[PDB]
Design an enzyme around this catalytic site. Sequence first.
Site, PDB file in Angstrom:
ATOM      1  N   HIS A   1       0.848  -1.217   0.000  1.00 45.28           N
ATOM      2  CA  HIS A   1       0.000   0.000   0.000  1.00 45.28           C
ATOM      3  C   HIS A   1       0.873   1.254   0.000  1.00 45.28           C
ATOM      4  O   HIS A   1       0.761   2.084   0.915  1.00 45.28           O
ATOM      5  CB  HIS A   1      -0.986  -0.035   1.156  1.00 45.28           C
ATOM      6  CG  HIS A   1      -2.095  -0.997   0.930  1.00 45.28           C
ATOM      7  ND1 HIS A   1      -2.153  -2.209   1.571  1.00 45.28           N
ATOM      8  CD2 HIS A   1      -3.182  -0.934   0.137  1.00 45.28           C
ATOM      9  CE1 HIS A   1      -3.249  -2.844   1.201  1.00 45.28           C
ATOM     10  NE2 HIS A   1      -3.886  -2.089   0.317  1.00 45.28           N
TER      11      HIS A   1
ATOM     12  N   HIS B   1       1.828   1.496  -5.767  1.00 43.50           N
ATOM     13  CA  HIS B   1       0.386   1.134  -5.843  1.00 43.50           C
ATOM     14  C   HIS B   1      -0.442   2.341  -6.316  1.00 43.50           C
ATOM     15  O   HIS B   1      -1.288   2.184  -7.242  1.00 43.50           O
ATOM     16  CB  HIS B   1      -0.084   0.587  -4.494  1.00 43.50           C
ATOM     17  CG  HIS B   1      -1.549   0.308  -4.449  1.00 43.50           C
ATOM     18  ND1 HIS B   1      -2.133  -0.662  -5.228  1.00 43.50           N
ATOM     19  CD2 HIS B   1      -2.541   0.879  -3.735  1.00 43.50           C
ATOM     20  CE1 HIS B   1      -3.434  -0.691  -4.973  1.00 43.50           C
ATOM     21  NE2 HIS B   1      -3.704   0.254  -4.070  1.00 43.50           N
TER      22      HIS B   1
ATOM     23  N   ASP C   1      -5.067   5.743  -1.256  1.00 39.62           N
ATOM     24  CA  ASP C   1      -4.506   4.976  -0.109  1.00 39.62           C
ATOM     25  C   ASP C   1      -3.508   5.844   0.680  1.00 39.62           C
ATOM     26  O   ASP C   1      -2.676   5.278   1.410  1.00 39.62           O
ATOM     27  CB  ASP C   1      -3.845   3.678  -0.583  1.00 39.62           C
ATOM     28  CG  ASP C   1      -4.753   2.453  -0.680  1.00 39.62           C
ATOM     29  OD1 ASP C   1      -5.740   2.371   0.065  1.00 39.62           O
ATOM     30  OD2 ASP C   1      -4.435   1.557  -1.487  1.00 39.62           O
TER      31      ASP C   1
ATOM     32  N   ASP D   1      -8.175  -0.479  -8.462  1.00 39.58           N
ATOM     33  CA  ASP D   1      -7.544  -0.856  -7.172  1.00 39.58           C
ATOM     34  C   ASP D   1      -7.058  -2.309  -7.201  1.00 39.58           C
ATOM     35  O   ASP D   1      -5.991  -2.593  -6.594  1.00 39.58           O
ATOM     36  CB  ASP D   1      -8.521  -0.651  -6.024  1.00 39.58           C
ATOM     37  CG  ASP D   1      -7.845  -0.512  -4.682  1.00 39.58           C
ATOM     38  OD1 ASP D   1      -6.601  -0.347  -4.651  1.00 39.58           O
ATOM     39  OD2 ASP D   1      -8.580  -0.514  -3.688  1.00 39.58           O
TER      40      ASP D   1
HETATM   41  C1  LIG Z   1     -10.992 -13.215   0.076  1.00 38.76           C
HETATM   42  C2  LIG Z   1      -9.483 -13.176  -0.115  1.00 38.76           C
HETATM   43  C3  LIG Z   1      -8.696 -14.321   0.031  1.00 38.76           C
HETATM   44  C4  LIG Z   1      -7.318 -14.214  -0.178  1.00 38.76           C
HETATM   45  C5  LIG Z   1      -6.756 -12.974  -0.516  1.00 38.76           C
HETATM   46  C6  LIG Z   1      -7.596 -11.855  -0.656  1.00 38.76           C
HETATM   47  N1  LIG Z   1      -7.110 -10.557  -0.960  1.00 38.76           N
HETATM   48  C7  LIG Z   1      -6.223 -10.219  -1.969  1.00 38.76           C
HETATM   49  N2  LIG Z   1      -5.452 -11.150  -2.487  1.00 38.76           N
HETATM   50  C8  LIG Z   1      -4.597 -10.903  -3.469  1.00 38.76           C
HETATM   51  C9  LIG Z   1      -4.430  -9.640  -4.049  1.00 38.76           C
HETATM   52  C10 LIG Z   1      -3.381  -9.469  -5.117  1.00 38.76           C
HETATM   53  C11 LIG Z   1      -2.560  -8.321  -5.122  1.00 38.76           C
HETATM   54  C12 LIG Z   1      -1.570  -8.223  -6.093  1.00 38.76           C
HETATM   55  C13 LIG Z   1      -1.369  -9.252  -7.015  1.00 38.76           C
HETATM   56  N3  LIG Z   1      -2.109 -10.338  -6.967  1.00 38.76           N
HETATM   57  C14 LIG Z   1      -3.090 -10.472  -6.068  1.00 38.76           C
HETATM   58  C15 LIG Z   1      -5.247  -8.551  -3.492  1.00 38.76           C
HETATM   59  C16 LIG Z   1      -5.178  -7.220  -3.943  1.00 38.76           C
HETATM   60  C17 LIG Z   1      -5.988  -6.283  -3.339  1.00 38.76           C
HETATM   61  C18 LIG Z   1      -6.871  -6.651  -2.315  1.00 38.76           C
HETATM   62  N4  LIG Z   1      -6.931  -7.897  -1.907  1.00 38.76           N
HETATM   63  C19 LIG Z   1      -6.162  -8.869  -2.437  1.00 38.76           C
HETATM   64  N5  LIG Z   1      -8.912 -12.010  -0.437  1.00 38.76           N
HETATM   65 MG   LIG Z   2      -7.383   1.181   0.256  1.00 37.73          MG
HETATM   66 ZN   LIG Z   3      -5.539   0.619  -3.023  1.00 39.27          ZN
END
Ligand SMILES: Cc1cccc(Nc2ncc(-c3cccnc3)c3cccnc23)n1
Ligand SMILES: [Mg+2]
Ligand SMILES: [Zn+2]
EC number: 3.1.4.17
Length: 313
Positions: free
Chosen positions: A68, A72, A107, A217
């Site tokens: 963050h 980003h 952010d 995002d």
């Molecule tokens: C419900 C659940 C289960 C596991 C993880 C998750 N949240 C996130 N996982 C992966 C990414 C991500 C970032 C960069 C590259 N690839 C993937 C991500 C990005 C932004 C917010 N949340 C997430 N949510």
């Molecule tokens: Mg945010």
């Molecule tokens: Zn963000």
Amino acid sequence: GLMQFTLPVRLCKEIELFHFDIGPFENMWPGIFVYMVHRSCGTSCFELEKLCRFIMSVKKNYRRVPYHNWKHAVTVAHCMYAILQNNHTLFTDLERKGLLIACLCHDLDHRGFSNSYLQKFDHPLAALYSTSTMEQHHFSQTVSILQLEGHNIFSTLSSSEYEQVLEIIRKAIIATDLALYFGNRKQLEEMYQTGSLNLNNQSHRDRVIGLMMTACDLCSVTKLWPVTKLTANDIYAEFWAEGDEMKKLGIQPIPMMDRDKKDEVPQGQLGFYNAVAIPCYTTLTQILPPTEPLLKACRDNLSQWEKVIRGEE
Ligand SMILES: Cc1cccc(Nc2ncc(-c3cccnc3)c3cccnc23)n1
Ligand SMILES: [Mg+2]
Ligand SMILES: [Zn+2]
């Protein structure tokens, strides 16, 4: 006035594509942002002196956290640039100005911790802002920087135009609260399917801009696999630190945030693509057809995570 920003040929071409990576050279990110503002909005919509001072104050107010961070901010602004450039005539001059700035600021002063952790910690910000805690803080930080002397990039807008753009930025930043995304997309899905979706209806535009913000995002899931895979590490570095801090408060964290359950990350990503990302870009592609490349790239990355589970990498 006659001072364009020009990128090297490879960046000049690749920056137009949704899957562009802004690169590891931090000192080029301000110029990449100004380039996108000039092409998206015009060389005239901001005084370069004030814009440059605003950009550098925004940079200074992002922290040295794994995910963050300032990179980003610019990455999310680039995804918005690609959406706006592929939907030229669908957005007002004010919207184009507002949304690029909203993305850069969305952010501001993030600590690497979720709204849930703030609440369980009993952080002062959780008392000040009961829901969308960090997002209200991000908007508050945006207004604070706009009010620094020589930082008001909107100074040449009329009083009503000024209130409108700050309203666009506030809704856009609040929308990046992923807790609000699920209900927003469901409503957009119903409106598209029943045929009631009307972009002249302000409350409908607000919802569509909200979804665009979620899409920008999450845009790390729309990059080439090697970018997505390596960015995944950075997001999980924050999740695991938050998990550690949950254990310090005497609370077992969700598996997603538990560094002992590292084995479960691949299956956790499937859930995330299926429950959040794929539905987000599907509804976005229905509403804005030219954003299809984001959905296609997202599906490719889902398939790569499936290959990780099947031990094929
Ligand atoms: C419900 C659940 C289960 C596991 C993880 C998750 N949240 C996130 N996982 C992966 C990414 C991500 C970032 C960069 C590259 N690839 C993937 C991500 C990005 C932004 C917010 N949340 C997430 N949510
Ligand atoms: Mg945010
Ligand atoms: Zn963000």
